[PDB]
């Protein structure tokens, strides 16, 4: 699953393609800013305020 090359493009064409997809098209995480700490401070622990 991590080294796609182990999946035979001949003996397992579909399965392979499915993997290539998961890799190239699975959503990319992101972020957005929220809150106003000048008054509420910040409860965030492992992430930045």
């Amino acid at each position: 699953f991590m080294n796609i090359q182990l999946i035979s493009p001949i003996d397992a064409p579909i399965l392979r393609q499915w993997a290539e997809i998961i890799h190239r098209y699975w959503p990319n995480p992101s972020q957005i800013r929220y809150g106003a700490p000048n008054v509420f401070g910040s409860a965030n622990l492992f992430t930045p305020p």
Binding site: N3, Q5, L6, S8, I10, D11
Partner: protein
């Protein structure tokens, strides 16, 4: 019309249908070369040549 295998490759013990080998010799060579390569790196990932070569 046929190939004689050495080491490794003395492990081919299952039904021929499982291996999916092509029928022409010159095509077979490519087929083998490629797969064997992939495996090689798989080995080197666990045993870096820098330290396990001997």
């Amino acid at each position: 019309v046929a190939v004689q295998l050495f080491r490794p490759l003395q492990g081919l013990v299952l039904d021929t249908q499982l291996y999916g080998f092509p029928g022409a010799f010159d095509d077979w060579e490519r087929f083998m070369r490629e797969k064997l390569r992939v495996l090689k790196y798989e080995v080197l990932r666990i045993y870096p040549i820098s330290n396990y070569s001997n």
